[PDB]
Design a binder for this molecule. Structure first.
Ligand code: D1U
Ligand code: D1U
Lengths: 213, 213
């Protein structure tokens, strides 16, 4: 009755921990790939709810939103796709991230590029190229909304609040690094969206803050 | 498997919140009553396990320990009594604290003294006379160990860790206010223990840090 919420703390698997330390510390020059990777993830979540709707009509217009916030120095990638249940968030999609990370690091060793992250299903982690903390708020039809957060110190948290009113989908918030403020600028974001826009079957809306007339 | 622990956050009932704000801010000159109140609480917990042992032998030597720590600026009152389950901690002993607080504040209004706190069953809160944060670690035979913590901001937390190895009883840790450092000194603690020692049916051990010979 007087309950405000709860926070569970988990340690990452050893592999994911190495990936995070690698990404957050790399000098990789083409950091902008993070946007493509998050929009790619968002698109796959919209595909999952779409492919599901081809069996049950009970699960409106699927879209992807890119929201900069110069005040909080954050960048958000919002979608209204399938969403993630607590088991999805708490396990880091389970065997998906673990096998993916091992295989991705094995690819980089053998000659690969950081840009190949997505081929291993672990493109979400590229968010740490431009961010030092990432907040993932997801709501799946089969569960309530949860908040995943990590700053890459070997751990992450799962926060549950009964005061929650989050609709189906995923909201990924990127707390931008001092040097990565360029990803707030709407001219940089427009260029990047257009760059992959033709390859994503869903509308991508950019919500930016002046018209001279 | 990779779980480190959890923290639940609750808001105090309105009455308990007023009691806490009153205690933590009062100029009451005889703050030393906090020790009597905690030792009294500790004794009642030893009585509960004793009265229980008069029916079942399965529930060794019941004692009360007073532990100062000049390094962390903390004072601890440890007992090996009945302990408190999660429901005991999460509800603040339920109807006990709520009715007690209302009745205690009604007594003070009518002419009462802060020292009467214990007659209302809410003497635990007197710990806020000398402390700005109180940590309560309790283990009951019917449950695992939990950690209650509050700094009197209208809320408290319940922390559960699977890494826990706390034996039956209650450990109350008082994070002492700048002006209340006198309660670390072993001469002050010896005087106070002796002052009520004859009225408590359990041994009270003081664990202090020099013998000149
Ligand atoms: C495809 S529909 C269901 C899954 N969708 C998504 C998955 C991720 N991924 N992927 C991975 C992993 F494991 F690397 F693949 C991870 C995450 C986020 C995390 C918080 C679970 C940590 C994590 O490990 C990110 C965003 C979405 C989205 N936008 O829906
Ligand atoms: C008597 S055997 C079972 C209960 N024993 C104890 C109870 C308290 N009390 N009493 C109250 C209340 F409600 F004011 F009475 C409260 C608490 C601690 C709290 C964290 C539950 C917050 C709180 O509200 C403190 C210490 C012990 C002990 N040493 O065993």
């Amino acid at each position: 009755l007087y309950f405000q919420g709860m926070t569970e703390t988990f340690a990452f698997q050893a592999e994911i921990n190495q990936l995070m330390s690698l990404i957050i510390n790399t000098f990789y020059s083409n950091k902008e790939i993070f946007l493509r990777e998050l929009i790619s993830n968002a698109s796959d979540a919209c595909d999952k709810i779409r492919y599901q709707s081809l069996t049950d009509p009970s699960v409106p217009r699927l879209c992807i939103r890119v929201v900069p916030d110069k005040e909080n120095k954050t960048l958000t990638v919002e979608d209204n796709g399938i969403g993630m249940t607590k088991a999805d968030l708490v396990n880091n999609l389970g065997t998906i991230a673990r096998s993916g990370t091992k295989a991705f690091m094995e690819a980089l060793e053998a000659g690969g590029d950081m840009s190949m992250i997505g081929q291993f299903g672990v493109g979400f982690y590229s968010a740490y190229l431009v961010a030092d903390r990432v907040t993932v708020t997801s709501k799946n039809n089969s569960d309530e909304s949860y908040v995943w957060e990590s700053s890459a110190g070997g751990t992450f948290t799962i926060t549950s609040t009964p005061e929650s009113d989050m609709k189906r989908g995923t909201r990924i918030t990127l707390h931008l690094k001092e040097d990565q403020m360029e990803y707030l600028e709407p001219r940089r974001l427009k260029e990047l969206i257009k760059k992959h826009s033709e390859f994503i079957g869903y509308d991508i809306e950019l919500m930016v803050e002046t018209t001279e007339k």
